[PDB]
Design a binder for this molecule. Structure first.
Ligand SMILES: CCCCCCCCCCCCCCCC(=O)OC[C@H](COP(=O)(O)OC[C@@H](O)CO)OC(=O)CCCCCCCCCCCCCCC
Ligand SMILES: CCCCCCCCCCCCCCCC(=O)OC[C@H](COP(=O)(O)OC[C@@H](O)CO)OC(=O)CCCCCCCCCCCCCCC
Ligand SMILES: CCCCCCCCCCCCCCCC(=O)OC[C@H](COP(=O)(O)OC[C@@H](O)CO)OC(=O)CCCCCCCCCCCCCCC
Ligand SMILES: CCCCCCCCCCCCCCCC(=O)OC[C@H](COP(=O)(O)OC[C@@H](O)CO)OC(=O)CCCCCCCCCCCCCCC
Ligand SMILES: CCCCCCCCCCCCCCCC(=O)OC[C@H](COP(=O)(O)OC[C@@H](O)CO)OC(=O)CCCCCCCCCCCCCCC
Ligand SMILES: CCCCCCCCCCCCCCCC(=O)OC[C@H](COP(=O)(O)OC[C@@H](O)CO)OC(=O)CCCCCCCCCCCCCCC
Ligand SMILES: CCCCCCCCCCCCCCCC(=O)OC[C@H](COP(=O)(O)OC[C@@H](O)CO)OC(=O)CCCCCCCCCCCCCCC
Ligand SMILES: CCCCCCCCCCCCCCCC(=O)OC[C@H](COP(=O)(O)OC[C@@H](O)CO)OC(=O)CCCCCCCCCCCCCCC
Ligand SMILES: CCCCCCCCCCCCCCCC(=O)OC[C@H](COP(=O)(O)OC[C@@H](O)CO)OC(=O)CCCCCCCCCCCCCCC
Ligand SMILES: CCCCCCCCCCCCCCCC(=O)OC[C@H](COP(=O)(O)OC[C@@H](O)CO)OC(=O)CCCCCCCCCCCCCCC
Ligand SMILES: CCCCCCCCCCCCCCCC(=O)OC[C@H](COP(=O)(O)OC[C@@H](O)CO)OC(=O)CCCCCCCCCCCCCCC
Ligand SMILES: CCCCCCCCCCCCCCCC(=O)OC[C@H](COP(=O)(O)OC[C@@H](O)CO)OC(=O)CCCCCCCCCCCCCCC
Ligand SMILES: CCCCCCCCCCCCCCCC(=O)OC[C@H](COP(=O)(O)OC[C@@H](O)CO)OC(=O)CCCCCCCCCCCCCCC
Lengths: 64, 64, 64, 64, 64, 64, 64, 64, 64, 64, 64, 64, 64, 64, 64, 64, 64, 64, 64, 64, 64, 64
């Protein structure tokens, strides 16, 4: 061989578990979800946050 | 590595616990909830405020 | 950091304890409640006013 | 801050103690109450008028 | 402010002491009361007319 | 500036006191009200006509 | 403007005193009232017819 | 316009004095009244038939 | 700087207190409100007119 | 142009007095009305058939 | 054209005097009526069957 | 320019008083109205036909 | 041309009286109708099947 | 052709008399009907099952 | 074929005679029926249980 | 297979013979029955308790 | 040119009264209309077929 | 944690032992009870006042 | 793993045994129950308070 | 293989037996149920809590 | 051949009987169903879970 | 030729009865259908699976 193997580390660290990008994604889910809930009063929509957390955790496991 | 780690602090402070944004969100919940209650007279809708407070507190705990 | 901290004061004063907005909300509750009472003759509906007053007072305490 | 403080006076005067709106509300209570009494012959329903008067007086005291 | 003060006069005259509406209300009380009396033979029901007259007179005193 | 002041007259005359439009509105109130009364036998609904007349008269006073 | 004044006549004649529409309304009141009376045996309900006649006559007086 | 004047005749004949509809109404009064009398043994209820006949005759006089 | 300051006057006069536009807005509120009331018979809807008047008056105060 | 005058005949015959369409409409009224009557036992609903017949006859008179 | 005249026969036969549909309607009236009678013990409700039979017979006479 | 004046006649005749188009519009109102009435049993909906006739007559008066 | 006349037969046979397509349409009506009936318990909805059968039979008669 | 005739058999067998689909439909009627009966205690609702059975049997007869 | 025949067994066993679903249905009938009886003291309502048992037994016989 | 057989035990134990739910039901019968007896002094109403006990015992026997 | 007059015949025959194209159009209307009716159960939608037939007949009259 | 603990005091004071709300409740019990007694002459109904007093006192003890 | 375990404490404390929310619920039960009792004079309705207390205590035991 | 098998554990733990999500669901059932009971005074509604507990326990058994 | 046969196994295992995807689907049904039940209190909605289980089991049988 | 006849076999096998592609299509229908059902709770949507199976089977018969 993979002629670009050397690039895997930084990329994986910049889009990975404790990255700035994942923090921004969780913040966005929190804000957008609470705004949707305030507008519609559909309590189930708050589970969105849970979903995103799980999806980003488990999902990052498949990134090799 | 995280090539954007240095950006975590300000972002987290601007969308975080004692931020202007969270204050605006709580104000919005209060106003919208009391307006819904005045229109429909459904007392349970006022619990919306509680929900939002809890959701923003606990939720911000998962923002690393 | 909070890059928008400077905006907290005016916002809090315009949607806060002795604001024009809260006065309008209490007026709306009074009018709508007395209209509901005239139509239905359900005396309990007048407690709506009390509820709104309490909800706006206590609620504004959680706005930091 | 209260960026809309200047609007408090006219609003309070148009929905306040000696306003056209309160006169209309008392007239409506009188007419609707006497119609209910003529139909059902329930004398207690006439106390509705008293209630409305009291509710609009005391209630307007909490409008600051 | 009272931005609608100019409307008080006609309204008060159309739902007031010597109005067509009050005449219709007294007529309705008379007819409905005499019909109830013919059906049930409860003499006390005729006092309904008295009540309505008093209620409309005294009541209109509180309309300012 | 008022660059459209010249348009005030005709508009005010076409939606004003003795206009075709106001005649149509009063006719509609009469027909709809008598139909509601025939269906439900709620005599109070006929006061709708009175209300509309008053509302269109007093209301047109605020049209400057 | 009154740019639609020319339309007043036919409209007023088609929904007016001796119109087909008013005839249909009186017929409907007669039929519905006698059906209600046959079902409930409440003699007062027959006064509905009187009411409708009066309401359509006097009411049409206010149509200018 | 009266743009629907031409429709008055048939309508008036189909809901009028010697119509099928009036025959059905009188039949219904007879049957329902005799059934009520058989159940309750209140002789006065039979006067219902008289009432209906009178009401349909006199009433049809006001249909122009 | 304000390179467009010279434009403030006419604009403010064409959308301001005694403008043709505000007259049209009040007319629209009157017509739409009375139509809603005729359809639904919800008396509170007529307060819409009051609201609009107040909102346009107080609101125009904040236009500098 | 009237550049489409030639089309009047067939259209008028296909939606007119003795058309297949009017037969279907009367059949629909009969079926729907008897179904409503079976469900609710409201005898007056059967007059629907009469109404439809009259409405289609008189109405077709205004189709020129 | 009447461009759909050819369709009259089958339609009239499928919703007509001796059709499967009319049989189903009479069966439904019988079952629903006897169920209502068992529940309420109101003997008059059984006349429903008679009504339906008459209504379907006479009614089908007007289907041309 | 009026460089198209010559076109006024045919247009006015093809969309005018005794045109094929107006006939189609009245037919459509009749059919749609009777279908709505069969479905909902709201007798007032039949007045739609009257409205359309009046609206097309008076309206065509303003077409110059 | 008619330069495509030769295509009429197969088309008419594939969308015609005893075609696979018409069988699928009748099956769909049966399934959808019984599902609607199970959900709503509105017996009249089952007549949908009858309608579809009639509509496809008579309708196919006009396909030349 | 009928260019799709060969498809009739399997379709008819998969939505036909002894199919999995019809079994599911009867099961659904049984469950939904007994649930409705438990909630409302309206015994007549159980006849729904009978109706569905009949409707699916007779109906499948018209599927050719 | 019936392209879905293989699915009949499990479905029939999961909604059939000795299934978890039927047990839940009988439990629900027992609880709801005894609650209705405690509230209304109508002994006949307890026969509901019998009905449900019979309906589920006999009904499941028609599930092929 | 019965794909949900494994769920039978806990359900049956939670709504069964010695469950918290049955205890609550018997308590409710006792309280409601003694309250009815205190109000009406109808001694037979106390047999309600017996009925409920029997109904819950025998009934639970049919829960398989 | 008319240098293309010779082409009028075949074109008119291929898109004309008894053409393959018109047959396809009527088939499409039948299928689409019955599908819409099965989905929505709006009986009026079936009149679409009538409309199309009329529109194609009368319309083809204006094709010279 | 209890994120809303700070709100307990005012709420408890506004709906508590010596509150305006409890005063209104006792007044309502007194008026309604004496009106019931005047109508029915059932002396026991006056014990209602006692009940309410006790219920509000003891009940407020369980409010923590 | 439970990726949201850390959130259990505050939530449980904000909706738990000695929370502001439970206090509000008990207050609401007290007020609504005493209002129902004043209106209906059904003493048993006061047991509602007991029920709510028990339900909130025992119920909170199952919150893990 | 199942290319996503590794994700089963955390997901199952975050939506499983002792998760934060299930705690929130039980809390929601408790609050909503007690609010419904306070409003309607239907004691059976409190069994909702039981149902939810059972449904979440047994249901989680089928999650493999 | 089938030039892509080699891909069948992994696909079938990743969307098949004991896959992560099917687990997520069952979890989603459980959560959404219990949320719907808490909101609407319609017990039948809980059968959704059963349906999904059956549908995914039987359905996966047809995946070859 | 047919200069490309030799290509028919592999193509037909790769998009044919037991191909990887058809397996993927059935899987997609199953997943999408169960997701739609979980969201909307419309049981009829599950028949989608049946439809797809039938459509792919019968349809592949016409591929020569
Ligand atoms: C400077 C402008 C000040 C505006 C007036 C202040 C409040 C006066 C209270 C009047 C109440 C009666 C209105 C009836 C006319 C009207 O609009 O009727 C609309 C609607 C009619 O009520 P119903 O639900 O019975 O009617 C339903 C349908 O018929 C409506 O189409 O009223 C409501 O739903 C009232 C609920 C108020 C919800 C709370 C509002 C909180 C915001 C406070 C106001 C905004 C301030 C703006 C600042 C610039
Ligand atoms: C300048 C315009 C002034 C308007 C007149 C002022 C009030 C006169 C009182 C008449 C009462 C009788 C009306 C019966 C005709 C009518 O509408 O009947 C509608 C409805 C009929 O009462 P029921 O509930 O018995 O009937 C139910 C159904 O049959 C209705 O379809 O009446 C009410 O519900 C009355 C409750 C009033 C609720 C309080 C209203 C408070 C607002 C005050 C009025 C608005 C002011 C507008 C300012 C621009
Ligand atoms: C210009 C129009 C003037 C209208 C006539 C004026 C009043 C005449 C009095 C007739 C009374 C008998 C009517 C029986 C025919 C009728 O409608 O019966 C309906 C109903 C029948 O009474 P029951 O409660 O015994 O019957 C219950 C059911 O059978 C009704 O379906 O009567 C009442 O409830 C009467 C209570 C009147 C409530 C007070 C009304 C106050 C408003 C005044 C009138 C409106 C003025 C409109 C101005 C444009
Ligand atoms: C030159 C044209 C003149 C038009 C006639 C003038 C008014 C005649 C009054 C007839 C009333 C009965 C109509 C029933 C036929 C009809 O349309 O029924 C529709 C609808 C049926 O009432 P429901 O709410 O009971 O029915 C609900 C549904 O079944 C409707 O689909 O009626 C209304 O809602 C009436 C409310 C009127 C709202 C106020 C209207 C104010 C505007 C005045 C009219 C416009 C003037 C146009 C100028 C060019
Ligand atoms: C050229 C067409 C002429 C139409 C006939 C003229 C009127 C004949 C009177 C028949 C009354 C009995 C109808 C029962 C059949 C029927 O429709 O029942 C529907 C409904 C049934 O009454 P209930 O409220 O007891 O029933 C409730 C439900 O079962 C209805 O589904 O009747 C009414 O509500 C009647 C109230 C009439 C409201 C006033 C109507 C004013 C408009 C006048 C008529 C329109 C003219 C149209 C001009 C083109
Ligand atoms: C061509 C069709 C001719 C129809 C027959 C003509 C009238 C025969 C009289 C039979 C009366 C007994 C029916 C009991 C069967 C029945 O329906 O019971 C329903 C109901 C039962 O009366 P109760 O109030 O005691 O029962 C209440 C509940 O148990 C009902 O569910 O009866 C009435 O309310 C009768 C009041 C009639 C109201 C006046 C009707 C005026 C319209 C005239 C008839 C319509 C003509 C249609 C023309 C196409
Ligand atoms: C020089 C031109 C003057 C124009 C007339 C002035 C206002 C007259 C008021 C008539 C109101 C009734 C119209 C019904 C005919 C109509 O358009 O109906 C459309 C629509 C129908 O109302 P619904 O929401 O019930 O109907 C929904 C759908 O059926 C519409 O397709 O009406 C509205 O939504 C009204 C809301 C007005 C919103 C406020 C408008 C503020 C702007 C003021 C006007 C513009 C001035 C232009 C200056 C050049
Ligand atoms: C050549 C085709 C001939 C078609 C049959 C002719 C009419 C037969 C009458 C059957 C009525 C019962 C249908 C129930 C099956 C059905 O569709 O139920 C749908 C619906 C169910 O009524 P509900 O309002 O009680 O149900 C509401 C919901 O459950 C519907 O989903 O029925 C109606 O609303 C009926 C109103 C008819 C409105 C008037 C229609 C006027 C047009 C005439 C027919 C079109 C002719 C087409 C020519 C090509
Ligand atoms: C080939 C299919 C043949 C179907 C059977 C023929 C009719 C058998 C009569 C059974 C009546 C009892 C049904 C109870 C089961 C049921 O559905 O209950 C639903 C409903 C329950 O009545 P309630 O109003 O007491 O209940 C209200 C609610 O609980 C309903 O959810 O029943 C009715 O409203 C009956 C009124 C019938 C209206 C007249 C119908 C006219 C159409 C004729 C039938 C359609 C023919 C279709 C041809 C393909
Ligand atoms: C030479 C061609 C002549 C065409 C026939 C003339 C009119 C016959 C009246 C039939 C009415 C029933 C149609 C139902 C079949 C149909 O299309 O249903 C579509 C739609 C269904 O009504 P709903 O709103 O209940 O249904 C909503 C959805 O289900 C529609 O997908 O009907 C309407 O909205 C009718 C409103 C008519 C609006 C006014 C039209 C004015 C124009 C006049 C006609 C055009 C003339 C063309 C000249 C070349
Ligand atoms: C060789 C392929 C044969 C296909 C099967 C033949 C028909 C079997 C009938 C099954 C009906 C149930 C389907 C539910 C699954 C489904 O698709 O649900 C979709 C939809 C769901 O109905 P709802 O309106 O209640 O649902 C709305 C939303 O949830 C949809 O997302 O169903 C309909 O709208 C049915 C209306 C049928 C309209 C008439 C169709 C006429 C065409 C005939 C079929 C095409 C033949 C193709 C030949 C190659
Ligand atoms: C291989 C998969 C087999 C699936 C199971 C077979 C049927 C089992 C019967 C269970 C009924 C209870 C479901 C409640 C759970 C549920 O979905 O509740 C949804 C809904 C809830 O009923 P309500 O109208 O009371 O509720 C309204 C709202 O709360 C819904 O959100 O139920 C219905 O409307 C039932 C009407 C069935 C309409 C007839 C369906 C005909 C199709 C047959 C089934 C499809 C077969 C698919 C083949 C692959
Ligand atoms: C694994 C999960 C097992 C669930 C428990 C099994 C059944 C236990 C019986 C408890 C009954 C009392 C519930 C009261 C709590 C509740 O929900 O109250 C809601 C409602 C309240 O009844 P009311 O009509 O008096 O109340 C009306 C309103 O206040 C409701 O908001 O109850 C009913 O309508 C009961 C009718 C049951 C209809 C038959 C259901 C058949 C399906 C069987 C159960 C589904 C099985 C799911 C399998 C996964």
């Amino acid at each position: 061989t993979d002629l670009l193997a050397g690039g895997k580390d930084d990329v994986k660290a910049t889009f990975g578990a404790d990255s700035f990008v994942m923090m921004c994604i969780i913040i966005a889910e929190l804000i957008v979800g609470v705004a949707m809930y305030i507008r519609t009063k559909n309590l189930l929509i708050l589970l969105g946050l849970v979903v995103v957390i799980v999806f980003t955790t488990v999902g990052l496991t498949f990134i090799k």
